[PDB]
Amino acid sequence: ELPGVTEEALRLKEAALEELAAQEVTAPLVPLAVSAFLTSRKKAAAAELADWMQSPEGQASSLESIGRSLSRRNHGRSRAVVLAHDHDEAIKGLRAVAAGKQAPNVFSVDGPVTTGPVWVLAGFGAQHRKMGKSLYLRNEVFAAWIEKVDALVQDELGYSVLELILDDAQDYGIETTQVTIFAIQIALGELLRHHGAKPAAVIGQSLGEAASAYFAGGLSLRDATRAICSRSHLMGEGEAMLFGEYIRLMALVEYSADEIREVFSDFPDLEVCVYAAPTQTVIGGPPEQVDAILARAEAEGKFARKFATKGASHTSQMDPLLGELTAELQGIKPTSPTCGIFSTVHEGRYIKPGGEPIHDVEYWKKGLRHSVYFTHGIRNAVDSGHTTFLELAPNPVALMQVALTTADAGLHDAQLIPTLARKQDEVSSMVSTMAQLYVYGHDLDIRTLFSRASGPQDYANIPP
Amino acid sequence: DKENFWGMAV
Ligand SMILES: *C(=O)CCCCCCCCCCCCCCC
């Protein structure tokens, strides 16, 4: 069996709840689904619902009850959702649906998207101090999955990730950034699955690869936790011992793989960490050469930025860790994927549902050591009909890279769906995420966005 | 890119 929740986590939980229970209540974000076989019929339903919502009877009915009723309707070809906090938002929203006009809190589409979603598991550079905390405190399903990863990581590494999440005083490091994002990635995916969602395919990026292997059915939750724990601690301990001449930095710079081929001939020890976008690459190596490429970008008008690490993931530097990584991962049982995988480790190539297991000890070693072919994997997805990309992350930084690839590939209207972001209400964010998934017609039981009704007052007399 | 209060890459 597994360690329980630590007494300290409980202590921090009690105090967090104390704090939460004392903030001014913010009105919840409610999704309003409006659906029909034809778009014209959808637009008239929209207009009807709006009219009724303007009437005293409609004005007396809670947004939540309107939503629950709307959610129980039959959901057809042409869909819309209005995301609202209050009646006025709601009406303004529904008018736009009716008028075929655009709005930030509105999504409206003529029919389903024809291919399933790609779940993007990245993480690199997305951490922030409070990530996952608010959703942990407010969502029992999410909480449950966090606590399961917390239990398994306590077992693996001897500390509590949940403590970090709950404690505003702690920030994240090389090691704890990785396992905590991972917990959050696992819990988000399973929250989503709880509401009916499923990935058609996954794509990993750097530290996200362990989560993607779990959601692809490539490894058990325990074995995926091993992969992330083995690597993050080795990496943190290695990077902590680095000073002066051994230090290797990481930076994002606005050069393509092709520009980098030429540019690198001035910088013999630079390596490519992540091909992020067609025009963006994360490079790594000696500070003086990293500093030099940065200043050459600056002088050419190109963007660049350093990552906070004394160590360069995805290079030859990582060679001393591989011995121990190998040994720590003995026993992991790679399994046949239950969904498609764009493997950024394996150069962006696609592995089929039912295919051969890829997630063996050497995959983890290859992934840590070598370049991450993210953009190539994304292009491969797009070229095969995928248009929905949903990022499971505390902050949707990879999705922005995804966007650059889709556009470059000519897909100017992809479905780019974030989850959590810093400075956005986390409960709201997930409602929004599941509403988007509904609209585009991917798997998602919208009824589950509402608690089972306790009485007639939990429904609304919306027009037929 | 500014991903806004509703999950939209603006
Ligand atoms: C994707 O793997 C990287 C995400 C993790 C963020 C922190 C950066 C990792 C760099 C660690 C390398 C140091 C090891 C040095 C061994 C001698």
For chain A, domain boundaries = 1-240+311-464, 241-310
CA A352, CA A174: separation in Å to the nearest integer?
A: 33
Distance A262 CA to ligand 1 centre (A): 26
Q: How far apart are CA A185 and CA A187, in angstroms?
A: 6
Tell me the CB-side half-sphere exposure of residue A430, using CA atoms within 13 A.
28
Interface of A with B (CB under 8 A): 83, 104-105, 396, 399-400, 403, 416-418, 421, 424, 428-429, 432-433, 436
CB A219 within 8 A of CB A274: no
Stated resolution in angstroms: 2.2
Could you confirm whether domain A241-310 is CATH 3.30.70.250?
yes
Look-up of token digits 């509403």? A435
CA distances from A333 to A2, A146, A150, A181, A208 (A): 20, 23, 21, 23, 19
The residue whose C-alpha atom lies closest to atom 6 belonging to ligand 1 is A174
Cβ proximity of A198 and A339 under 8 Å: yes
Contacts of A352 (CB under 8 A, 6+ apart): A337, A340
Distance CA A324, CA A322 (A): 5
Pick from A155, A207, A161, A440: which is nearest to A314 by CA? A207
Q: Return the closest-CA partner of residue A105 out of A115, A96, A114, A116.
A: A96
Q: What value, to the nearest 5°, has the Cα angle with vertex A270 and ends A267 and A275?
A: 125
Pocket test of ligand 1: the residue of A131, A179, A235 to mutate, having most ligand atoms within 8 Å of its CB, is A235
Other C-beta atoms closer than 10 Å to the C-beta of A207 total 28
| Residue A124 backbone phi and psi in degrees, to 5 | -40, 115
The yes/no answer on whether domain A1-240+311-464 falls in CATH 3.20.20.140 is no
Which of A184, A307, A309 best tests ligand 1's pocket when mutated (most atoms within 8 Å of CB)? A309
Is residue A373 packed enough to be buried (19+ CB in 10 Å), middle (13-18) or exposed (0-12)?
Answer: buried
Contact A80, A44 (CB under 8 A): no
* Residue of chain B minimizing CA distance to A83: B6
DSSP state, A108?
E
Method: X-ray
The dihedral sign for the CA sequence A395, A398, A399, A404:
positive
Q: In what order do the strands lie in the sheet with A201-204?
A: A349-351, A340-343, A201-204, A118-121, A388-391, A415-417
Q: Which residues of A are less than 8 Å from B9 in CB distance?
A: 399-400, 403, 416
Closest C-alpha to A94, from A66, A83, B8, A429: A83
Please name the member of A400, A403, A418 whose beta carbon is closest to the beta carbon of B7.
Answer: A418
A408 close to A278: Cβ distance less than 8 angstroms? yes
Interface test with B, best of A400, A425, A437 (most B CBs within 10 A): A400
What span, in angstroms and rounded, lies between the C-alpha atoms of A209 and A199? Answer: 15
Closest C-alpha to A310, from A370, A245, A266? A245
Q: Which of A419, A447, A372 lies closest to A119 in space, CA to CA? A: A419
In CATH terms, are A1-240+311-464 and A241-310 the same topology?
no
Residues with CB under 6 A from ligand 1: A 124, 174, 177-178, 206-207, 235, 238-239, 309, 311, 313, 317, 320-321
H/E stretch holding A307 reads strand A304-307
